Symmetry: C4
Subunit: 338 residues, 4 copies
């Protein structure tokens, strides 16, 4: 049965641990893959962890030999249980309630091609349009009403690039618009469904200490801006969750360095520029080194609830480190020091 | 289909071997986890072995990095086939006939939080109430009428602590009472269903050479006392099985040391203080070293019987050793020397 | 659906390779168990290989620590994919069309107990009756009409022992007779169903260069004698297949040594003492060393045929060697030199 | 549900990557089999990779000990997840929509026998007819209307051999014709279904720099000739795809050496001898070394389409190298340099 995604995002007062991936103590003598920036996506039956690898084992990069593989959430990414998904140096994935959609980018940095697979079968492709490193989300893609959306970027990492939003049905591209977003930069977008709309929070690698966002409907009509908590432009992939005018911001404790990770609830942060917030919870302590982060969601079809549960993953730098994921609850929680 | 648990416990005249877990001869060159105190719980389809580990392999502790994992009963606890359940330094688990319920305690010894998962999804949480090492059963939780109960302790290991009984439905806490049990100590409780009631036998680490018990109904009304075989207070986790006024006691042969393991049937031991018994069977010989023990059960939905079959596991110290489990029969059996 | 077993055994003019088990070239660096005398039994869905092991890996005996494990036919017997069945130093197994029946013998040589499991659950037991090494078939048990039979021996390996035939339904012993067979010896019996009867060919370790057999019905009425091809008494486990008065005999080429293996069709060999035969096929060459052999069958429920297909396994000594299995066809075949 | 195969082959304007098999970087410390010339075949649910091996692991040939094994496409061919199919030094396989058909050749070079299995059961056999190295396709067999066809060769590799086409239903040979094809040589035939006909393109190892083909119906009526792109005779296994009078030819870039791999669309190449073509795409660059190649297809029952999708695999020499497979699309693609 196809995912609906017409319900609202669940109100969460706190965040609690879900799983720990990329364990390295097991890797000391065990056959385990050397992976970086794993991402999590969920089906109606189970959650899975996706990663890119060249097959390099520990105790033993745009590459045509680099592939996307996956294991059940919390499992060890070993060559003996990882499933093969696609060939890609940049990739994203999601489940539409029927099967898995996998989007992978392979080929030369001057003529890259994205190969779209549905249930293991190649269904479509999309070739570079500005000929300069085609790249995708490196996260879960959002699905609403059996269709799964995504945001792709082609162009310079330090300048004005072209951005395109794609609606994909059963592996095929049915609609696609080009964004008019001058002076915005949208790399590594973290997207989630909310009441039959798609909301994405992206990484500005050009001139934005704050994070840009794009919001769009199934027809691909869109709005843009920055999280005001300046509303204009003022990096590492991140995320946030919209609740009316309030926003849950995932960020480091330090500004100049990668230290700590905390989740702040700013009830007027979507539209206001004030620094006020109501509550805060420590996810990662100041001594640890925080790194890449992104969101994923658990749909009603999986949780048995009448709303969508917001979750997220933080990769701790330590080097590779570990990818710890957490999920949102409305019950009591404490700060966490890993 | 949800488990009923309304039938009585099966009368057993003897105990016969079921499986051997934590094998170490296989571990000499094989990638196997270093585990301690594994516990067994059964679903309607299969029995599984649960353990806590940091990912340390052999031939290579309250920790936020310590996790709960599981393998099919009798299988090798390797990184290539263990399933991930939760993040916890103390944990329990059971199946309600529909899905798995996993209860894990993580966080700081001064503010621990128990995370309750149902079918892999976080459904609820319960924060420490006396702020002193929240800890659970380290065994199977009991289920009756689709609801699964448990007993949690918060407080000193050598003094008067607070004890709370929790009724959990589909991962959520629907009811919870605090026990009034002055001069009792209830750690590591081993619980089983019997005719729509829950009976638990616990470890008194304070001032009880005998074992305290608590018995309660679905509504959480309860009675307490000691196994009289003194009825008041006179350690290592253990178990016993109630049959009217008779009790099957799992204990060591020696008193001052951990030597041997035997099962004694005292037909008046629940309420009497006499040392008389009718029958006895050796499970483990005097030379071997016995250690932690606990019970688990096999429901009619799994066995095809019209009663609940009592089983149990003994960890042999040897160090880690091996966790051998046995099940109750009404057929001929012999003593066992491992 | 339960197996019927009311059809006749399929007429075979030849034998063709099925699978190769116990590979050792893979074991040179791979984690593989050290096993001896593996046996094959089939379910309606798949065939599986069973073996006993202490967990000893290569490149690293009546024992309470020795267990019975299994892998899909042709698969490598590694600790990462072997399933646990039971604890035993002597064992047999078969499928009744619904679930697996496993019979394992454990305990002391002076008071051994056989533990009968059905679908992983202990259902019954049978204690030694002459107190001298209880031992079973080390092969597949036969099933006819949802019930599975077996032949067990208790007594000296070089003298007159007691033999008992057991009919088992869903793991429980419903009927059991003691054989009156003076001057016969029946160890390691290889049994198969044929038209709602059970036929077993056993190893005489006392005073029979030929092989004794027992034939019995569901009610356990029986006949005994030797394969005449003397009809009375004149070792290593073996087998034969009855077709009217003709018999297919699996034997070595040499008499005084373990060299070669051949299958001979003697159309009057069941009842005649003549040395005449019609056809012969080489399975194993003279240079190789043959060893233990036994039979198993593939039922109509698995093959899609209107008869039961006779198969067999030969362990080549080489030491452990390899266990090669073959199946009967009515099509052209050649001799085989491994 | 049985495969129909009555639809036409899908028109493809380009070829895009599907999977990478035989990875060796993983093999540096991992337990992985040493394999050569793996082939791909697809079922209605999944695609699988087949290979022959003696069990030799890396970091550790007609042989009765050599077997055919398989893993999911893109998975590592390790001893811990490879499935056993048959015993053979030459083999082919395909799925008929119900189960797997496996054809393996074993036995002596002077009296080889092909063993046909269906769903793991031996169903039939075919003995050598010219007594000189019986050999099969080393690829996927074609299936149309629940029946699966194949082409087998018996005779010299440098002269006139006998060729026979076999129609197999549920593992049994129902029809078989001998080809009259003087001065033709047909080894390692790559076959695919197209509109209820079977088309095969073979390797002429005798005196043909071009490739011979045979085309036949379910009744086994056939036509022969060469791909004209001379129509008569003018090596390494290869393939081509027929689209009316046009042909998609898989070949190396160099003539005298194994360098590069490209796919050329010659709209009149089936029947014309001209060197003209409309389009060309690079699969493998000139520096790399190309080697064995063959075709396989993805049926409507798997893809959800109303036509059959043509795919193919190229083994890159590097030694073993890697087996990269591609599939046909009608969307934009680029050249590939591995
Ligand atoms: C989503 O759509 C389903 C019908 O497919 C409906 O039953 C459900 O109530 C809708 N939920 C919301 C929040 O609109
Ligand atoms: C969802 O898609 C269906 C067609 O499958 C359409 O009829 C319906 O209007 C859509 N609903 C929304 C909320 O877009
Ligand atoms: C338990 O409840 C079921 C109904 O769900 C009933 O059929 C069964 O007899 C009851 N067993 C006992 C011991 O009360
Ligand atoms: C079991 O729960 C059901 C509701 O699901 C309730 O109606 C019934 O009375 C309960 N029975 C017992 C024995 O508690
Ligand atoms: C075996 O019994 C079944 C009924 O369960 C019957 O249909 C079949 O014909 C019988 N076969 C023989 C050989 O008697
Ligand atoms: C098989 O068992 C059934 C009962 O399940 C019985 O009615 C029938 O007579 C038996 N048939 C044979 C051939 O023993
Ligand atoms: C193939 O046969 C099926 C019936 O089994 C039919 O529905 C389908 O249209 C046919 N396709 C072609 C191309 O003839
Ligand atoms: C396919 O086989 C069926 C019988 O299963 C037959 O009736 C039909 O005519 C065949 N069709 C073709 C296209 O050969």
């Amino acid at each position: 049965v196809k995912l609906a995604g017409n319900s609202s995002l669940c109100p969460v007062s706190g965040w609690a641990p879900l799983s720990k991936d990329n364990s390295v103590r097991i890797g000391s003598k065990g056959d385990v893959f050397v992976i970086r920036e794993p991402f999590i996506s969920c089906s109606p039956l189970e959650c899975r962890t996706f990663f890119l690898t060249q097959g390099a084992l520990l105790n033993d990069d745009r590459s045509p030999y680099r592939t996307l593989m996956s294991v059940p959430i919390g499992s060890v990414p070993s060559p003996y249980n990882a499933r093969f998904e696609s060939i890609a140096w940049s990739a994203s994935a999601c489940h539409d309630g029927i099967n898995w959609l996998t989007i992978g980018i392979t080929g030369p940095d001057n003529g890259a091609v994205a190969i779209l697979k549905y249930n293991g079968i190649i269904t479509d492709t999309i070739k570079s349009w500005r000929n300069n490193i085609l790249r995708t989300q490196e996260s879960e893609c959002a699905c609403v009403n059996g269709s799964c959306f995504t945001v792709m970027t082609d162009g310079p990492s330090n300048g004005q690039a072209s951005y395109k939003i794609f609606r994909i049905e059963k592996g095929k591209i049915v609609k696609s618009v080009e964004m008019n977003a001058p002076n915005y930069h949208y790399e590594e977008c973290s997207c989630y469904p909310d009441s039959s709309e798609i909301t994405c929070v992206c990484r500005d690698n050009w001139h934005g200490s704050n994070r840009p966002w794009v919001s769009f409907n199934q027809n691909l009509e869109y709005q843009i801006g920055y999280i005001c908590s300046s509303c204009g432009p003022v990096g590492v992939k991140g995320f946030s969750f919209k609740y009316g005018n309030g926003v849950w911001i995932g960020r480091t404790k330090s500004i100049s360095s990668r230290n700590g990770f905390e989740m702040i609830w700013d009830p007027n942060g979507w539209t206001g520029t004030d620094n006020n917030f109501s509550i805060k919870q420590d996810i990662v302590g100041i001594n640890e080194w925080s790194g890449y982060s992104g969101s994923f969601v658990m749909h009603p079809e999986l949780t048995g609830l009448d709303c969508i549960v917001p979750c997220f993953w933080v990769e701790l730098i330590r080097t590779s480190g570990s990818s710890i994921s957490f999920c949102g609850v409305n019950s009591d929680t404490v700060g966490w020091s890993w």
